[PDB]
Homo-oligomer: A and B are copies of this chain.
Amino acid sequence: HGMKVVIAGRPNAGKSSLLNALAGREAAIVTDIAGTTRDVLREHIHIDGMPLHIIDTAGLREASDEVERIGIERAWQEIEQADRVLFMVDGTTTDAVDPAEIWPEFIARLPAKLPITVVRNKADITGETLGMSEVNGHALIRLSARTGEGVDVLRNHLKQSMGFDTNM
A→B interface (CB under 8 Å): 28-29, 31, 33, 36-39, 41, 65-67, 70-71, 74
Contact = CB atoms under 8 A, between A and B. Distances in A.
Q: Is the interface of A mostly helix, strand, loop or mixed?
A: loop
A64 to B, nearest CB: 12
Given A31-B67, A38-B39, 8 more contacts: A28-B39, A29-B38, A29-B39, A29-B70, A33-B66, A36-B38, A38-B38, A39-B39
A59 to B, nearest CB: 13
Nearest to A38: B29
Nearest to A32: B66
Nearest to A16: B39
A38 B30 CA distance: 11
A66 B25 CA distance: 20
Q: Please give the count of copies of this chain that the complex contains.
A: 2
A31 B41 CA distance: 18
A23 to B, nearest CB: 12
Contact of A36 (B28, B33, B67): B67
Contact of A29 (B31, B33, B36, B71): B71
Contacts of A74: 29
13 contacts: A28-B39, A29-B38, A29-B70, A29-B71, A31-B67, A33-B66, A33-B67, A36-B38, A36-B67, A37-B39, A38-B39, A39-B39, A41-B41
A30 to B, nearest CB: 9
Nearest to A77: B26
